[PDB]
């Protein structure tokens, strides 16, 4: 209804943020030149995965296919299932996952994982575009139906078959909260990912699925499953829950929001997405990477921050329009643990981004812009 229609105000907020981001562009590059390393002449924009050409489409399932087909950096000691490239994505996700959510490096890190998979599916599988983004929105009342997950040739593989099952339950550790479930749940059977194998995690079992070998790390081959559905999507990744993101006042309102809060029934849109796409491995939060999907999902993970931090730049609007680009919050997920559990240090932005042997580390303060640091790209609408 309302909240699956795209609200003018909406629509309005992306376009300031983008030309917010192209007039300070215009001003760095001068004041730069006067005395650089993104300008609007080399700004990119990532793409709405729907609006790309038929071709564009199938260039990005091609590139993805061609890096789960390069031989691994990870050491064969370090994981034993990584058999490809991709899977060096996956294996970073696995052994940090404990410390990267719910934590202040929580977005900086999945900005710069991105970036990393999508350097790499240009420079070693000569893709010649930038990673899409899944609007989550457009598509919230059938996700199964988009151009992303409808098993056209085009699309990211359909969902899994359906099979009987009852949506995820959270319970609360040392009251219990259902989701509902998707239309899925079963082998991904359709599209260019039909019968993709999967070859680590998962790290939690999942209900058709033990822990896999040395704690999701060894080898176990196995089908892609999904468990597409509006259920999830409506409820937790609406055009409401994106207006209420971008009008947050700070950064930790915006990641209260964003990330939901834990053993309660708001989720948010990220957790309320990755149980979207759900299934096998994206029902196993460390190996989520392990399905395409995670990669259009993070893209629009980072394009509602990138916006949210370019409506910044405003007039009142921030004082300091700088704000949004070093403040990495005050709240309970601003440490360098898991919600602040155990109790640690406030993260920094000095802080390391560790990607492990899947690709350059760098620091949080390397990341903070997307047209800073080797970062020079944005987001169409
Ligand atoms: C769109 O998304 C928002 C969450 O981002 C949903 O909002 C909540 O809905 C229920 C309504 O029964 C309330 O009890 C909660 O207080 C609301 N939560 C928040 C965080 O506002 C909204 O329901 C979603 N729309 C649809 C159609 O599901
Ligand atoms: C919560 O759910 C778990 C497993 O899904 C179950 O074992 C546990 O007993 C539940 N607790 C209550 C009070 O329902
Ligand atoms: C996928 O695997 C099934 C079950 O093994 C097989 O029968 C089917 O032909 C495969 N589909 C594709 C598109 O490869
Ligand atoms: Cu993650
Ligand atoms: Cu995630």
């Excluded at 071709?55 to 490809?84: F, I």
């Excluded at 899944?134 to 699309?155: E, H, R, V």
């Excluded at 959270?170 to 019968?195: D, H, K, M, Q, Y």
């Excluded at 990641?255 to 809060?261: A, H, K, L, P, Y």
Aim: proline share 9%.
């Amino acid at each position: 209804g309302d909240d699956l229609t795209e609200p003018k105000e909406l629509t309005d907020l992306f376009e300031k943020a983008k030309k917010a981001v192209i007039d300070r562009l215009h001003e760095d590059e001068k004041a730069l030149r006067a005395r650089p390393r993104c300008t609007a002449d080399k700004l990119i924009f990532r793409r709405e995965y729907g609006s790309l050409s038929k071709d564009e489409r199938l260039a990005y399932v091609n590139a993805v296919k061609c890096l789960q087909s390069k031989p691994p950096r990870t050491p064969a000691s370090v994981a034993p299932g990584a058999r490809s490239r991709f899977d060096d994505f996956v294996v970073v996700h696995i052994q940090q996952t404990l410390d990267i959510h719910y934590s202040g490096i929580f977005q900086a890190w999945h900005r710069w994982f991105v970036y990393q998979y999508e350097k790499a599916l240009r420079d070693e599988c000569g893709y010649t575009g930038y990673q899409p983004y899944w609007d989550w929105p457009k598509y919230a009342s059938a996700p199964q139906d988009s151009p992303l997950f409808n098993g056209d040739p085009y699309s990211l593989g359909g969902n899994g078959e359906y099979v009987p099952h009852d949506g995820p339950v959270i319970v609360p550790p040392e009251g219990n909260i259902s989701l509902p479930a998707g239309v899925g749940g079963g082998f991904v059977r359709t599209g260019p990912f039909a019968n993709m194998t999967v070859n680590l995690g998962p790290v939690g079992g999942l209900a058709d699925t033990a822990p896999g070998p040395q704690g999701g790390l060894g080898y176990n081959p196995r089908g892609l499953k999904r468990d597409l559905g509006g259920a999830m999507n409506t409820r937790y990744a609406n055009y409401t829950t994106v207006l209420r993101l971008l009008t947050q006042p700070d950064v930790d309102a915006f990641r209260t929001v964003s990330e939901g809060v834990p053993y309660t029934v708001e989720i948010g849109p990220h957790n309320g997405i990755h149980y979207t796409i759900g299934g096998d491995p994206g029902g196993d939060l460390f190996t989520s990477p392990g399905d395409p999907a995670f990669w259009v999902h993070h893209a629009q993970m980072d394009r509602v921050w990138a916006t949210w931090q370019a409506l910044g730049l405003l007039p009142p609007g921030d004082p300091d329009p700088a704000r949004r680009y070093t403040d990495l919050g005050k709240g309970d997920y601003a440490h360098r643990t898991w919600q602040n559990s155990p109790p640690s240090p406030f993260a920094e932005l000095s802080d390391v981004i560790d990607m492990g042997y899947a690709a350059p580390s760098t620091t949080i303060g390397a990341v903070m812009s997307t047209t800073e640091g080797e970062l020079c790209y944005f987001y169409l609408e």
